[PDB]
Amino acid sequence: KVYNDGYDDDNYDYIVKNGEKWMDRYEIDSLIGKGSFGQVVKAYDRVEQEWVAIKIIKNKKAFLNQAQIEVRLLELMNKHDTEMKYYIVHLKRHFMFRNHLCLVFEMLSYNLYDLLRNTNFRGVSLNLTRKFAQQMCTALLFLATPELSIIHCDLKPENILLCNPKRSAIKIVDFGSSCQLGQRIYQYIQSRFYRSPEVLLGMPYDLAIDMWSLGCILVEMHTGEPLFSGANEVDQMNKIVEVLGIPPAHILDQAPKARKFFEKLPDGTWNLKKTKDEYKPPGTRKLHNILGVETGGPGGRRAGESGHTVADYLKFKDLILRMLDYDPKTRIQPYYALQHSFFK
Numbered sequence: 001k002v003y004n005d006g007y008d009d010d011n012y013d014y015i016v017k018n019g020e021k022w023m024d025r026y027e028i029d030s031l032i033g034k035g036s037f038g039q040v041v042k043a044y045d046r047v048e049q050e051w052v053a054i055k056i057i058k059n060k061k062a063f064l065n066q067a068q069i070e071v072r073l074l075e076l077m078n079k080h081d082t083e084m085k086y087y088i089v090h091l092k093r094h095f096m097f098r099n100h101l102c103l104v105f106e107m108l109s110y111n112l113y114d115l116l117r118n119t120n121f122r123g124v125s126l127n128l129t130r131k132f133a134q135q136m137c138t139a140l141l142f143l144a145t146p147e148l149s150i151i152h153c154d155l156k157p158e159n160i161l162l163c164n165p166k167r168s169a170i171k172i173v174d175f176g177s178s179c180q181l182g183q184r185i186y187q188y189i190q191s192r193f194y195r196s197p198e199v200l201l202g203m204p205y206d207l208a209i210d211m212w213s214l215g216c217i218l219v220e221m222h223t224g225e226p227l228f229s230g231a232n233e234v235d236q237m238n239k240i241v242e243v244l245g246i247p248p249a250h251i252l253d254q255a256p257k258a259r260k261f262f263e264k265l266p267d268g269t270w271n272l273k274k275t276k277d278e279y280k281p282p283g284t285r286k287l288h289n290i291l292g293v294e295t296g297g298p299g300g301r302r303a304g305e306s307g308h309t310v311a312d313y314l315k316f317k318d319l320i321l322r323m324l325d326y327d328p329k330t331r332i333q334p335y336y337a338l339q340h341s342f343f344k
């Protein structure tokens, strides 16, 4: 009947009551998101005197444990990150309230999935896409400092928030499914739309997986829609092969899951496998035409606008193709990304 003295519901989640004060400190405004992890409320802090977002974790051991890993990793980033200038969302403090791990974060404006939706899935300025990329490149650079070596493992529009609603300064969230570099524990990682070939094929993954995600994320912020929107892993791979071609032989020869999507022919090469129930041939929907670098941008709608010339679109195709490199070792890394001619 009543679980945890009637504070929790059937899903072990704390039932939110708008107005309820905690610990003569936090004043709960409302609920704003939920997830697997638990819930995220809006709440004023009277000691510091600001709005904060408190991530309420579910009163259950499995969720308490992985939230505890995340708290470790965030605190660890706050040791390096001194002047909040590497675009990570700040963990402020954490406490136990009524048998729930609560994480207090800095409060932020809507995520980039909301921003995309507010333009009815038709994207925003190349000018803004450059600002977001620069900011996200440095955040990655920071994650790749050797002491950290933190892989987010889940970058999508959903996990990138704006600081101010009238300013382009962003941050990253959701390190709850995010590990450090090391021996391979999981295989089924990342959101499908933004999952890399090394993962789909089931090979050793390192910090380059987040760079693939970003690569997919930036195109979506300018076009409006996902670059690769696969129903399942078989569709996803095929949709990558629509654009980037069949992956190189030496990578497919190594891949454990290379027969889920391909077949090795009698003459050494790899071909696609036919399916249940119409794609384009490998590498024939070229990003040049997806972005529309000669046709006034994504579906013509940027023709004539400042900073959307063939000159500017070519720099943005070059970096994006360089991020979407099939090979995790030659793929571009954040220190060279920032050097690229696109941020000039």
Ligand SMILES: Nc1cccc(-c2cnc3[nH]cc(-c4cccnc4)c3c2)c1
Pocket: 032, 033, 040, 053, 055, 089, 105, 106, 107, 108, 109, 110, 111, 161, 173, 174
């Ligand atoms: N209104 C709204 C919509 C989407 C995200 C947020 C928001 C604002 N600030 C935040 N700080 C930390 C989070 C957050 C995000 C994901 C999981 N747990 C906390 C967080 C979320 C707020």
